[PDB]
Amino acid sequence: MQTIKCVVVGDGAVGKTCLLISYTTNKFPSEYVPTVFDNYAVTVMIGGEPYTLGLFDTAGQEDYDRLRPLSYPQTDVFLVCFSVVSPSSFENVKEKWVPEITHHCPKTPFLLVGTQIDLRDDPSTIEKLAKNKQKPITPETAEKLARDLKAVKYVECSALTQRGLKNVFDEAILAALE
Amino acid sequence: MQTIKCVVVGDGAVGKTCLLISYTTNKFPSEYVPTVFDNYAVTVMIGGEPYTLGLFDTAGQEDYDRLRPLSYPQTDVFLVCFSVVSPSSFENVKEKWVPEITHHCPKTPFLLVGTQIDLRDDPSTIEKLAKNKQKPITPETAEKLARDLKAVKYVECSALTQRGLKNVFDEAILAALE
Amino acid sequence: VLVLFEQMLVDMNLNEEKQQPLREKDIVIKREMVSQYLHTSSRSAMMYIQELRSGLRDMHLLSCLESLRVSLTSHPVSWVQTFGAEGLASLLDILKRLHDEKDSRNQHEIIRCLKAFMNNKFGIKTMLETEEGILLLVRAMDPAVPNMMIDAAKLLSALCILPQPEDMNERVLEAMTERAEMDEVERFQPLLDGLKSGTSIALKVGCLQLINALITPAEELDFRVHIRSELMRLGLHQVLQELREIENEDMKVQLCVFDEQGDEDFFDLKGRLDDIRMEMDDFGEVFQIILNTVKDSKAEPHFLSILQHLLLVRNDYEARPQYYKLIEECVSQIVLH
Amino acid sequence: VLVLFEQMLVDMNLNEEKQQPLREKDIVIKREMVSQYLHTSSRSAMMYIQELRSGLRDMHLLSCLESLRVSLTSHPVSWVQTFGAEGLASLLDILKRLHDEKDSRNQHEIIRCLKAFMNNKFGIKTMLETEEGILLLVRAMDPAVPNMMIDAAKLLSALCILPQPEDMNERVLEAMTERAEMDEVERFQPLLDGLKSGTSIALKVGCLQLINALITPAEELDFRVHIRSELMRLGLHQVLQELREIENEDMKVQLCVFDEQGDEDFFDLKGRLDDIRMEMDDFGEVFQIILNTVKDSKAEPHFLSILQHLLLVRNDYEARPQYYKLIEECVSQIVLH
Ligand SMILES: Nc1nc2c(ncn2[C@@H]2O[C@H](COP(=O)(O)OP(=O)(O)NP(=O)(O)O)[C@@H](O)[C@H]2O)c(=O)[nH]1
Ligand SMILES: Nc1nc2c(ncn2[C@@H]2O[C@H](COP(=O)(O)OP(=O)(O)NP(=O)(O)O)[C@@H](O)[C@H]2O)c(=O)[nH]1
Ligand SMILES: [Mg+2]
Ligand SMILES: [Mg+2]
> So where are chain C's domains?
1-41, 42-247, 248-337
At the top level of CATH, which class does the domain D248-337 belong to?
Answer: mainly alpha
Partner residues linked to A6 by β-bridges: A55, A77
Q: CA-CA distance, C215 to C262, in Å (whole number)?
A: 10
Q: Of how many residues is chain C composed? A: 337
Instruction: Name every residue whose Cβ is closer than 8 Å to that of residue C243 and which is 6 or more positions away in sequence.
Output: C195, C204, C208, C251, C255
Q: Could you give the dihedral angle defined by the CA atoms of residues D123, D125, D131 and D137, in that order, rounded to the nearest 10 degrees?
A: 50
Instruction: Name every residue whose Cβ is closer than 8 Å to that of residue B87 and which is 6 or more positions away in sequence.
Output: B129, B134, B135, B137
- Report how far apart the first and last C-alpha atoms of chain A are (Å, whole number): 21
Taking the CA atoms of chain B, what radius of gyration do you get in angstroms?
15
The distance between the two most distant Cα atoms of chain D, rounded to a whole number of Å, is 95
Residue of A nearest to C32 (CA): A70
Distance of CA A84 to the CA centre of its chain: 11
Q: CA-CA distance, D285 to D304, in Å (whole number)?
A: 17
Q: CA-CA distance, A61 to A68, in Å (whole number)?
A: 10
Per the entry, the structure determination technique was X-ray
> So where are chain B's domains?
1-178
| Residue nearest to ligand 2 atom 11, measured at CA | B13
DSSP labels, B43-109 = EEEETTEEEEEEEEEE--SGGGTTTGGGG-TT-SEEEEEEETT-HHHHHHIIIIIHHHHHHHSTT--
Q: Which amino acids of A are annotated as binding site, given as ranges?
A: 10-17, 57-61, 115-118
Residue of C nearest to D323 (CA): C226
CA distances (Å), origin D150, targets A131, B29, C305, D124, D146: 35, 36, 42, 18, 6
Look at strands A49-58 and A37-46 and give their pairing: antiparallel
Q: CA-CA distance, B75 to D124, in Å (whole number)?
A: 34
Phi/psi for C194 (5° steps) reads -65, -25
Looking at chain C, after which residues does the C atom sit over 2.5 Å from the next written N, breaking the chain? 41, 102
Query: What is D1-41's CATH topology?
Result: Histone, subunit A (1.10.20)
Q: CA-CA distance, C151 to C236, in Å (whole number)?
A: 22
CA angle A65, A71, A77 (to 5 degrees): 115
For A122, which DSSP code? -
Q: Could you give the dihedral angle defined by the CA atoms of residues C163, C167, C173 and C174, in that order, rounded to the nearest 10 degrees?
A: -130
3-state secondary structure labels for all residues of D50-71: HHHCCCCCHHHHHHHHHHHHHH
CB contact under 8 A, C40 and A63: no
Q: Could you give the dihedral angle defined by the CA atoms of residues B16, B17, B21 and B24, in that order, rounded to the nearest 10 degrees?
A: 50
Q: Which amino acids of B are annotated as binding site for GTP, given as ranges?
A: 10-17, 57-61, 115-118
3-class SS of residue A50: strand
Q: At what angle do helices C320-335 and D221-233 cross, to 10 degrees?
A: 30
3-class SS of residue A152: coil
Query: What is A1-178's CATH topology?
Result: Rossmann fold (3.40.50)
Strand ordering across the sheet containing B37-46? B37-46, B49-58, B4-9, B77-83, B110-115, B154-156
Measured between beta carbons, the chain D residues lying within 8 angstroms of B69 are 40, 74-75
Task: Evaluate whether A163 touches A121 at the Cβ level (below 8 Å).
Answer: no
Question: For residue B30, how many C-alpha atoms fall within 13 Å in the half-sphere facing its CB?
Answer: 0
For C132, which DSSP code? S
Q: CA-CA distance, C120 to C123, in Å (whole number)?
A: 5
Q: Hey, of A7, A75, A95, A103, which one would you mutate to test binding to chain C, going by the most C CBs within 10 A of its CB?
A: A103
Task: Evaluate whether C142 touches C206 at the Cβ level (below 8 Å).
Answer: no
Q: How many CB atoms lie within 10 A of CB D76?
A: 20
Whether A104 and chain C come into contact, CB under 8 Å, resolves to: yes
Q: CA-CA distance, C253 to C259, in Å (whole number)?
A: 10
Whether B103 and chain D come into contact, CB under 8 Å, resolves to: yes
Does C touch D (3+ CB pairs < 8 Å)?
yes
3-class SS of residue D222: helix
Phi/psi for A53 (5° steps) reads -115, 120
Task: Evaluate whether B168 touches B113 at the Cβ level (below 8 Å).
Answer: yes
Q: Hey, of B58, B68, B95, B103, which one would you mutate to test binding to chain D, going by the most D CBs within 10 A of its CB?
A: B103
Instruction: Name every residue whose Cβ is closer than 8 Å to that of residue A98 and which is 6 or more positions away in sequence.
Output: A80, A110, A149, A151
Ligand 4 is an ion; residues with CB less than 5 A from it: B 16-17, 35
CATH for C42-247, options being 1.10.10.10, 3.40.640.10, 1.20.1250.20, 1.25.10.10: 1.25.10.10
Q: CA-CA distance, C114 to C175, in Å (whole number)?
A: 17
Task: For ligand 1, say whether the CB of A158 is within 6 Å of any of its atoms.
Answer: yes
CB contact under 8 A, D273 and C334: no
